[PDB]
Enzyme design. Structure first.
Site, PDB file in Angstrom:
ATOM      1  N   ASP A   1      37.400  47.654  35.525  1.00  0.00           N
ATOM      2  CA  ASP A   1      38.296  48.415  36.421  1.00  0.00           C
ATOM      3  C   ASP A   1      37.580  49.666  36.858  1.00  0.00           C
ATOM      4  O   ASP A   1      36.379  49.710  36.873  1.00  0.00           O
ATOM      5  CB  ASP A   1      39.585  48.738  35.668  1.00  0.00           C
ATOM      6  CG  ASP A   1      40.812  48.837  36.567  1.00  0.00           C
ATOM      7  OD1 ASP A   1      40.793  49.472  37.651  1.00  0.00           O
ATOM      8  OD2 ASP A   1      41.846  48.311  36.138  1.00  0.00           O
TER       9      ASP A   1
ATOM     10  N   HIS B   1      43.727  54.134  38.593  1.00  0.00           N
ATOM     11  CA  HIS B   1      44.084  52.687  38.436  1.00  0.00           C
ATOM     12  C   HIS B   1      43.809  52.194  37.017  1.00  0.00           C
ATOM     13  O   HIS B   1      44.692  51.667  36.345  1.00  0.00           O
ATOM     14  CB  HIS B   1      43.301  51.904  39.459  1.00  0.00           C
ATOM     15  CG  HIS B   1      43.600  50.440  39.495  1.00  0.00           C
ATOM     16  ND1 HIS B   1      42.715  49.493  39.013  1.00  0.00           N
ATOM     17  CD2 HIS B   1      44.632  49.750  40.035  1.00  0.00           C
ATOM     18  CE1 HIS B   1      43.212  48.283  39.218  1.00  0.00           C
ATOM     19  NE2 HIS B   1      44.370  48.412  39.849  1.00  0.00           N
TER      20      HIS B   1
ATOM     21  N   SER C   1      47.772  43.812  39.737  1.00  0.00           N
ATOM     22  CA  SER C   1      46.998  44.323  38.558  1.00  0.00           C
ATOM     23  C   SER C   1      47.942  44.682  37.395  1.00  0.00           C
ATOM     24  O   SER C   1      47.640  44.427  36.229  1.00  0.00           O
ATOM     25  CB  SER C   1      46.277  45.610  38.871  1.00  0.00           C
ATOM     26  OG  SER C   1      45.325  45.446  39.921  1.00  0.00           O
TER      27      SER C   1
END
Ligand code: NAG
Ligand code: CA
Lengths: 486, 92
Positions: free
Chosen positions: A26, A59, A219
């Site tokens: 990520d 994120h 996600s």
């Protein structure tokens, strides 16, 4: 006060993840955030394209928190290791992702631990090499969970979403409906394994070490399933990927998504499943899943193949075309293992092969085939051996157009019976017919649909949806073979 | 039998870097030698190349920064299964 998503995945009966390690590929993460402090190790592997700190790790930090967060995580336990393959803008490369997957494999070889779950909260277009790397890593015994993609599109057009050995996760909201994300939204279709909470998901915010932020996306959905997998594997560490996938399907909430949200042709292909943790309430049970092939395409001799996992048995085989221009299907052996093969008709746009793949240890299953009888009573074949059970009937034909353990087909068609010696197994057949676009017959609670077919007026096809046999036509009769542990 | 592939979503393509995927049982030593052979064959044609990474452990192969002009040459290397142009992935 419990975040909705964590309640949603909580089973109807209940009483983690520490033996398991979850790798995250990520963005960078804020590893000192208090949700995850001391539970996430930053590997400092980094392979990211150039751009073109709170924002940079937004994120990744959120997703580490969804997976393992102290307060708002799924597997509040679990240990994580993070690799950076996304830049500050959330962009990576296929090559960086490959190098990351390879790094995980090398790490494992050098210092073996227990079950590994790899979360890939990212997507690009279909990539042969990325799909191949995933498959290889899956075959090496690592569980991979990926985002379906946020393109309101067929997940089969994306990677790693499209890799069959990867658990691909779509996003549903608090109303169990597919998540809209601006003008787009969760992907769907036959490469999606299940859905999970992916709207308004509260988790660690890299703004500050104790801050939280709600985020939406496939996600986030995938992170729930990574968490659930980690929990399931902590409880049952010896699970094969196929056993884990069957459990994820089995313990999901079923038929709660309104499939109107999806394009019409994707409704049948899209699993209507929302992930949940296994209940504390759980001997042996018969698990089956429906595996749709890639569409065969329009070639006259086109065939679609639906396969099961190495440790599964193919108990039945059906097919479907939206036109109904179809030469049926057959169960054929291949590398010493039975596959479901479907045949396109002349002038057909193509067909799908639809396997029913089941976890049946100690089963000895075979196929009994008869060619077209060409006369009178139709084509018939039965499981003749003492104690063998019929689990599935298939039929294919080569023409342009037209009693226990017995399958019956059209007189001009070949008929194929899946016959298993499975002494712990009881099966019954339940029929239903009516005057009609779709006829439907369900197994009784606690029974597992093994086969679904239409009695041999122009049927498009038949397919199992969970434990309901659906027959599609343009009196038509659905027939379900339902089995259970005895 | 060696084939070339690139991203169908044209905006997500990253031309100029290629993943050279070799056949399954190819050994790391053979991958490295294949990379070197490419760089030598390229250099003889006046092309600069850079082997960014040699893959081993999941897939054998290498990542190479080169002109796509060399792809026909590259597809003829020993052990090649396929070559894929690098492309973009995105946080979901
Ligand atoms: C399946 O066949 C194997 C090998 O012949 C045998 O060991 C076993 O008894 C059989 N199982 C059943 C349930 O028929
Ligand atoms: Ca998948």
């Amino acid at each position: 006060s419990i975040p909705w998503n964590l309640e949603r995945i909580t089973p109807p009966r209940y009483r983690g993840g520490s033996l398991v390690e979850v790798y995250l590929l990520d963005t960078s993460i804020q590893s000192d955030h208090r949700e995850i402090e001391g539970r996430v190790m930053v590997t400092d592997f980094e392979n990211v394209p150039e751009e073109d700190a709170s924002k940079c790790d937004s994120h990744g930090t959120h997703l580490a928190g969804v997976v393992s967060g102290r307060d708002a995580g799924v597997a509040k336990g679990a240990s994580m290791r993070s690799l950076r393959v996304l830049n500050c803008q959330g962009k990576g490369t296929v090559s960086g992702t490959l190098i990351g997957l390879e790094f995980i494999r090398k790490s494992q070889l050098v210092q073996p631990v227990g079950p590994l779950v790899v979360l890939l909260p990212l997507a690009g277009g279909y990539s042969r090499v990325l799909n191949a790397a995933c498959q290889r890593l899956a075959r090496a015994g690592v569980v991979l969970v990926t985002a379906a993609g946020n393109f309101r599109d067929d997940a089969c057009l994306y990677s790693p979403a499209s890799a069959p050995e990867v658990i691909t996760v779509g996003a549903t909201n608090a109303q169990d409906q597919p998540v809209t994300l601006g003008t787009l939204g969760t992907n769907f279709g036959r490469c999606v394994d299940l859905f999970a909470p992916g709207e308004d998901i509260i988790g660690a915010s890299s703004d500050c070490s104790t801050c939280f932020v709600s985020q939406s996306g496939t996600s986030q959905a995938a992170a729930h399933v990574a968490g659930i997998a980690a929990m399931m594997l902590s409880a049952e560490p010896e699970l094969t990927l196929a056993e884990l996938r069957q459990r994820l399907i089995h313990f999901s909430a079923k038929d709660v998504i309104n499939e109107a949200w999806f394009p019409e042709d994707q409704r049948v292909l899209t699993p209507n499943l929302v992930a949940a943790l296994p209940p504390s309430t759980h001997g042996w049970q018969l698990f089956c899943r429906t595996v749709w092939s890639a569409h065969s395409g329009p070639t006259r001799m086109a065939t679609a193949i639906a396969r099961c996992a190495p440790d599964e048995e193919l108990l039945s085989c059906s097919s479907f075309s939206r036109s109904g221009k179809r030469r049926g299907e057959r169960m054929e052996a291949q590398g010493g293992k039975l596959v479901c093969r479907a045949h396109n008709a002349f002038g057909g746009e193509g067909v799908y092969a639809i396997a029913r793949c089941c976890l049946l240890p100690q089963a000895n299953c075979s196929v009994h085939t008869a060619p077209p009888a060409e006369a009178s009573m139709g084509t018939r074949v039965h499981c003749h051996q003492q104690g063998h059970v019929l689990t599935g009937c298939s039929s294919h034909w080569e023409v342009e157009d037209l009693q226990p353990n017995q399958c019956v087909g059209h007189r001009e068609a070949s008929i194929h019976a899946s016959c298993c010696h499975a002494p712990g197994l009881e099966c019954k057949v339940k029929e239903h017919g009516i005057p009609q676009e779709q006829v439907t017959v369900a197994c009784e609670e606690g029974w597992t649909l093994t086969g679904c077919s239409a009695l041999p007026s122009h049927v498009l096809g038949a397919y199992a949806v969970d434990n309901t046999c659906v027959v599609r036509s343009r009196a038509v009769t659905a027939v379900a073979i339902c089995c259970r542990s005895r | 039998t060696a084939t070339f592939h690139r991203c169908a979503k044209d905006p997500w393509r990253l031309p100029g870097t290629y993943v050279v995927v070799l056949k399954e049982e190819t050994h790391l030593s053979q991958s490295e030698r294949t990379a070197r052979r490419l760089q030598a064959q390229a250099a003889r044609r006046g092309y600069l190349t850079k082997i960014l990474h040699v893959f081993h452990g999941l897939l054998p192969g290498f990542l190479v920064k080169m002109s796509g002009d060399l792809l026909e040459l590259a597809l003829k290397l020993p052990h090649v299964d396929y070559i894929e142009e690098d492309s973009s992935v995105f946080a979901q």
